[PDB]
Write a protein that binds this ligand. Sequence first.
Ligand code: FMN
Ligand code: FMN
Ligand code: FMN
Ligand code: FMN
Ligand code: FMN
Ligand code: FMN
Ligand code: FMN
Ligand code: FMN
Ligand code: FMN
Lengths: 183, 182, 186, 186, 170, 189, 183, 182, 183
Amino acid sequence: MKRYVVGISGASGIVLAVTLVSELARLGHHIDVIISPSAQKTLYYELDTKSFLSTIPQNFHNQIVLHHISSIESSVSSTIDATIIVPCSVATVAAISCGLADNLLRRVADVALKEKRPLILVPREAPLSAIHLENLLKLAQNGAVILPPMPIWYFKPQTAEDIANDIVGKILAILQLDSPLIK
Amino acid sequence: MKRYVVGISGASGIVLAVTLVSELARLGHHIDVIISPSAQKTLYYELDTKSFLSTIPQNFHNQIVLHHISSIESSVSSIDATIIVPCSVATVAAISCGLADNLLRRVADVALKEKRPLILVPREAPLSAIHLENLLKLAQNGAVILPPMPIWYFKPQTAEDIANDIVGKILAILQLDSPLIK
Amino acid sequence: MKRYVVGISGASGIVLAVTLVSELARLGHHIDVIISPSAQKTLYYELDTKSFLSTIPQNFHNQIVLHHISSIESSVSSGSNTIDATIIVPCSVATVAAISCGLADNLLRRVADVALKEKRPLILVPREAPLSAIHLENLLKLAQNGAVILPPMPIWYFKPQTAEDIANDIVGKILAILQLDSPLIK
Amino acid sequence: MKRYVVGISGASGIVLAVTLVSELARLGHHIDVIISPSAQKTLYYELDTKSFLSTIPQNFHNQIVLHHISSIESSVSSGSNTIDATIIVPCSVATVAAISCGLADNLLRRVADVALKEKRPLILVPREAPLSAIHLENLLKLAQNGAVILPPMPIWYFKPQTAEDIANDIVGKILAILQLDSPLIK
Amino acid sequence: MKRYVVGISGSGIVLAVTLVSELARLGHHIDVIISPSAQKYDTKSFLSTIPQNFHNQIVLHHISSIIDATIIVPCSVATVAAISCGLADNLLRRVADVALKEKRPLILVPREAPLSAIHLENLLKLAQNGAVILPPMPIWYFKPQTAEDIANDIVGKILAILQLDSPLIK
Amino acid sequence: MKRYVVGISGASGIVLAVTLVSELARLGHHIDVIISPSAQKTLYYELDTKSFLSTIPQNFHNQIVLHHISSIESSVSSGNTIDATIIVPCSVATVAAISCGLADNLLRRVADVALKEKRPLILVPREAPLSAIHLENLLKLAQNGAVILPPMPIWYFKPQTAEDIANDIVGKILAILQLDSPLIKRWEN
Amino acid sequence: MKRYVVGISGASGIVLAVTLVSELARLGHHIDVIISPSAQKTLYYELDTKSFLSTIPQNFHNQIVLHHISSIESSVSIDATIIVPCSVATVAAISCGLADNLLRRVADVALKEKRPLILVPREAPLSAIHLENLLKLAQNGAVILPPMPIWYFKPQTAEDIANDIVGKILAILQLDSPLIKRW
Amino acid sequence: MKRYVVGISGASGIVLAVTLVSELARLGHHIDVIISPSAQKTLYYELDTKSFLSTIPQNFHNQIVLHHISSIESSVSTIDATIIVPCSVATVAAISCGLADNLLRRVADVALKEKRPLILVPREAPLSAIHLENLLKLAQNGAVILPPMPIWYFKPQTAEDIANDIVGKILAILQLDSPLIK
Amino acid sequence: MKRYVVGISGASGIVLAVTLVSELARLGHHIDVIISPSAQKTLYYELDTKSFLSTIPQNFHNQIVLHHISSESSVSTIDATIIVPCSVATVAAISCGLADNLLRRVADVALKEKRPLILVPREAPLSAIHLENLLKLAQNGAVILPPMPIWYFKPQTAEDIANDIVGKILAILQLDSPLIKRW
Ligand SMILES: Cc1cc2nc3c(=O)[nH]c(=O)nc-3n(C[C@H](O)[C@H](O)[C@H](O)COP(=O)(O)O)c2cc1C
Ligand SMILES: Cc1cc2nc3c(=O)[nH]c(=O)nc-3n(C[C@H](O)[C@H](O)[C@H](O)COP(=O)(O)O)c2cc1C
Ligand SMILES: Cc1cc2nc3c(=O)[nH]c(=O)nc-3n(C[C@H](O)[C@H](O)[C@H](O)COP(=O)(O)O)c2cc1C
Ligand SMILES: Cc1cc2nc3c(=O)[nH]c(=O)nc-3n(C[C@H](O)[C@H](O)[C@H](O)COP(=O)(O)O)c2cc1C
Ligand SMILES: Cc1cc2nc3c(=O)[nH]c(=O)nc-3n(C[C@H](O)[C@H](O)[C@H](O)COP(=O)(O)O)c2cc1C
Ligand SMILES: Cc1cc2nc3c(=O)[nH]c(=O)nc-3n(C[C@H](O)[C@H](O)[C@H](O)COP(=O)(O)O)c2cc1C
Ligand SMILES: Cc1cc2nc3c(=O)[nH]c(=O)nc-3n(C[C@H](O)[C@H](O)[C@H](O)COP(=O)(O)O)c2cc1C
Ligand SMILES: Cc1cc2nc3c(=O)[nH]c(=O)nc-3n(C[C@H](O)[C@H](O)[C@H](O)COP(=O)(O)O)c2cc1C
Ligand SMILES: Cc1cc2nc3c(=O)[nH]c(=O)nc-3n(C[C@H](O)[C@H](O)[C@H](O)COP(=O)(O)O)c2cc1C
């Protein structure tokens, strides 16, 4: 029974976080989830709800703890098998690359780097400027896994859901879990 | 009319290049297409065809010119925009180094040399420090770094919807009106 | 049974590849071997043969798969497929250069680039002398990206007698890094 | 007798390599020549032959050995065989890039990398215009590693009249770098 | 009628003469700035090299006197050095600096060989700040016959970057 | 007669220093030799003697001067005209010291002197694997003009014995010194 | 049983090395200990003894091997290497690769073999020169663990502060120990 | 009365250290002196003595305290300035690296750490790129880099005139008034 | 007969240039001498004369050619170039590539052709800006040779110190001269 921290930042593609958290729980693990106010908006615009938990089957709720973005005092903010920021806005990328650990989402990423525990970042921004590429580079040189949501067309997806599933499968493979989402 | 150069490199997502060349042809423009041998393989694994032109409406073919990857002597290697789509990280690395030793890499080098639009659509994951360093260098030298990332706020339903919206973003950066843009 | 990728680049010392692949098979493992055209020439000039398989005892051949240098579509070329460690032995400065730049445009360079981006073990056995500033910068950059830089340095405190002893003990160090127990290790 | 290696890469100005090799042979020296496939095409479009030897007096052919571009096993591929200087002329930016990376995966690139590692003279005659930041960075790195960067720029204070005058003066400056006495120097 | 600045830095003044007069033949205005180093003859005045009917279109400036594009041709390494440092302390240098400061075209035609690491670093820095680095490379696949052919094709390369049309462009 | 400095640093392969010094003296040259305390240990472990001079034919001793590692006042610690300086073998620690300019014993000083006078310095560094820290020091030294010559065996010369491999490595050193020695071999076809 | 190397360099806080070794031995492990000459001075000024082993319960002495600092040829020269306390001079040497005594050598071997290396550097203020060396060592895999007091554990005594600092070392070694405390 | 630290490193020019310490004591100041083993050798070769105090008038000895090089414990390890003179490139290298593993290197490190004056009088010729980088690094961290350059515009006649005016330059940097400054 | 360029920049120590030129001429060599306007005044202050040639023996004048700092000249192949003394302004100009007078050009030509360039900079203290310029020139092949007295030769007179410094220059020139003494 592994323990994961999933930080959800306000970039497009919150379905990726929904799918990842569902599958992590369906495989029996524990997830601490931190939703930023911008991801809260993205949740409404992209998935038509204001409750992240309503997107997750109810029997898995005892495996998910929501933490408020301001709780830098929380016990995730100080053991954890991996931390995943998905989706990850370039503003959150910039903060983590600076060390600017002044909310809980940014703190859990800094803690993963400080303890050399896995930190997977799923940035979504296009086009990518030189400023953002330099922050991404700096994070990769400090051991962050940089995993943009790149569709895998040789699995010949038919639906949008297929494309999301295969992207989450790649996150799970980086996490070294066996999931049927991995092709 | 406008003239475009589309280099197709051996990353996943050839459907993106099909869609782009198809729409550019449909708008009345000319496209010089350069297909790498790796892209020729990906064309088979992803679109179950060994002929690139068999995926474009036959009426458009008089607007498309296929160039062999080794024709470094070619006329395009001396104009409106150059698009490498999809773009492997090996081809990213070659362009970032200036290693213009085939026709695809040379048309990219020429765009950077002349300050003409170069759009790269790199696809790889994860992206290591080596590839990010190459990406950064190209962005600093004026290349538009446009990874094919799905636009979920358009609420796509099909895989084809996702490819169409990605290509719409390329068309928008080329500042062309197109139904593929939202 | 573990799975290993062995890239054979055209530097001097192909005997190192031969004895490494042979020992990996003898311990029961599976080896995917990628031979560059230059290493194919070095095999001839150094081992007087044109067939790499001809240097491996025959019962081991079922555990070895040869892959063409151009087969970038190979299943070993995907990160999805789990490899225990990738060894480029011997490794030319040309291939060091390509890997350090990200120039993953043949299968040998690609399997090395795949191990880097997946943070799986990549052992390079570079052989060149002298080492120029340009080579040392490429090696430095690969070490900073997690590759193990293992030049084939003779181990003289094992008091070798024959040229084969020097080679065996170099391969013993590769096997030590791989976390394997082997009679080649001292 | 001194021994030179001349690498001919696919940039414009193949006449410079003809003139240099002819003069080096006239002066009695030995020249190993490596013509890339792109330079073969430039030879036809600029000098209307497909045979580099045809542009040199036949009485000098005994001082010249042509090597295929893929022949990285050639004697001039090793640092053990002493070369007095290596000249890449003309030099495309693709080849500058390869040499600046250490990408020694053909004989022309290998020849240049061997000069840098042995610290023997390497003269590059790069031709491209304009020069982008990417290309200038490669040139810079090569100059910092000891390469002589000699772009083929006309020497107008000699008041050339003909195109051949300009080519001859430029080759004169290479020979001056080689510290060779020659009537093409002024 | 466009307005071009041609700065003549201290070998290869034939390139500047060829550019200025072709710009003039195309109906444009040229502000020429000649360094003392470039004034150092086989002719006394630079205006004597341009056809006289073009003279109303050309204005000479003293280099010690405190716009579509700026071309420095030929361009010495000291002038490259000064511009790359921001050392805008004569008229030639500060008109180059103005073009870099306003993101206007600056075409540099350096004629030094060999190029040492110090000069390459200055060129690189200028390229990274948007200057066009255009060394005078003969084009050869045009099969030039005279020295005059080679000069004209080099100037045609300048005009092409200026996005002008001219029979010098081949 | 040329004049050489051989520094013997405490890494594996002291047979390389024995072979080089012997061949330099056979050619008729003079060698100032400096042996670190670590190399003295390695001499014992690898060659089973505590006397470096016992490994060299006695008729050559008149061409060889041993210097104590702490004699920074020695004649060879001053930029006296030396034709080449070789540290063989060369530990990564000594590489580190030289690359920092930490010229606080005679072996490191002799290397610093070669660098400041732009006279040849050959380093025969031996260590495996090489970390990023060591690669960076090696890089720095190469950019400052040191020849970085790790003792890579030369298998295209089809060696049969350990001695063959050592001899060919020393032959590569002699080829960089631009000396004409039978230990040097050259590539063929 | 695991095997540890504890290098003791001449910085203030030698109590930290006493505590770490005692507890590692109490858990059943083997410790090779290297004391620099300056740490022997520090041991005298701070703990009033010239015998490191006089500070360790005698039943643990069979698990401890003391090495001389000049024994560069030692068999040590496996599970983790801790330099505690670590002087800035030792930080400087290790960051340079100046592996010219046994203490500097075992740290360099840890970095070369990519085994754990924990440095407990003690110096204040930290100049730019020392920060640069610390940065380099962190970028090459070393764990940089300055002996920062953990005040939210509300210590009463100086011993409390030393125990919690060692407990953090133990946590990084992924050992379980009654010195460790959870926030 | 002010307090100075004078480290004597093993480069040529130990007369400068003798002249400096003796003049600081003549002004009534206190000097802690640290002599490296190498400087002990150069004392012998350059000044025909094996006792540093023998070069100083005996009446000033009560203001001078000698410290062993290995004595990294010491109250010197409140100080008005620290002067390493002469300073070998090896000592420059150690200080630039933070290799504070003897008392001379340590007092220099302490001055840098506390932002107190550190004057280095390095003596070596030529200065290689390695030495210049270390010098640069030290200047960037606030050390004063004072190579012992003869002041010819004072028209010296003797070797002692040259050494005196060099020390006068140190004294000036120390903000002291002395007849050694012209 | 070798051919030297000696550039005389405006800094203290022109006696070094005087005794270098006369020793080069005494050995039978040819010297092109370039004297800056600032060096001419230092010549009168330090040597009590307006005429550089009045400090050189008249038998040597036929081996010396004086060039004006403002001149197109032919020194724009040489066995070596020495800038002695070398002011910080001259060092800065050469390190920037600012080759806009004959003295700067001759130094630039030496670097471009990879021929010996010896700089004798005389500034104390050396600021970070000046050390950076010096560093850049040493990396580009220039020999940085400050006039450092050689006290282990136990000089007695000011001229002794000056002659031994020029001896070091002559050693770097690989000239066998009786001004050179050896350790
Ligand atoms: C629907 C929606 C989608 C967004 N998508 C992205 C995106 O894909 N990439 C990005 O950089 N910002 C995106 N943004 C803007 C980010 O929310 C913005 O940078 C924000 O301040 C980041 O906040 P956070 O990272 O703390 O959650 C999006 C905003 C909205 C409302
Ligand atoms: C089916 C298939 C999919 C591939 N997808 C990618 C990819 O997404 N990204 C990548 O960098 N390489 C990918 N490759 C490998 C590249 O094609 C390979 O590195 C090649 O040498 C690049 O050459 P090119 O860029 O000239 O086409 C793929 C290969 C195959 C066969
Ligand atoms: C017999 C032989 C030995 C060689 N040894 C080396 C070597 O030790 N190091 C090296 O960098 N190149 C060596 N080469 C040259 C390389 O083969 C050449 O750089 C080649 O292009 C590298 O290709 P690869 O890395 O793709 O195999 C050798 C070539 C031959 C024929
Ligand atoms: C006629 C002709 C002239 C060329 N001139 C140049 C040139 O001047 N500079 C350049 O970078 N490439 C030039 N190229 C293209 C290069 O050949 C191309 O970059 C090639 O891949 C370089 O390969 P190579 O240097 O190994 O021959 C030219 C090509 C042709 C057909
Ligand atoms: C005949 C002659 C030709 C010259 N050619 C060049 C040249 O080709 N490249 C260069 O950098 N300097 C050349 N110079 C010297 C430059 O003019 C020198 O760098 C000058 O000081 C720069 O001043 P300016 O750029 O302000 O004109 C030449 C000088 C003369 C007399
Ligand atoms: C038998 C033996 C072999 C050694 N081999 C090496 C070696 O190959 N590489 C290395 O870096 N250190 C090696 N060492 C350790 C070094 O000698 C150690 O770092 C030493 O302090 C270097 O000192 P020196 O260079 O001043 O002689 C070896 C030690 C011994 C006892
Ligand atoms: C007479 C004599 C003069 C020396 N002069 C210098 C010198 O001028 N510069 C230098 O860097 N080293 C010089 N050295 C050698 C240094 O003492 C040597 O590098 C030493 O290891 C540095 O130790 P230290 O600076 O800690 O005293 C000299 C040695 C002697 C015997
Ligand atoms: C009682 C005492 C306490 C010390 N504390 C420190 C310290 O906290 N930090 C430090 O960098 N040096 C400290 N030192 C000085 C170091 O021991 C000195 O820098 C030495 O050169 C480092 O030696 P090492 O190789 O054992 O690390 C202390 C010395 C003494 C005597
Ligand atoms: C009497 C006198 C002595 C000078 N001494 C020096 C000196 O020792 N070092 C220095 O950098 N500048 C010195 N200068 C000032 C420089 O000459 C000044 O920077 C000058 O403008 C540089 O020009 P030049 O070196 O090309 O002649 C001195 C000036 C004068 C009047």
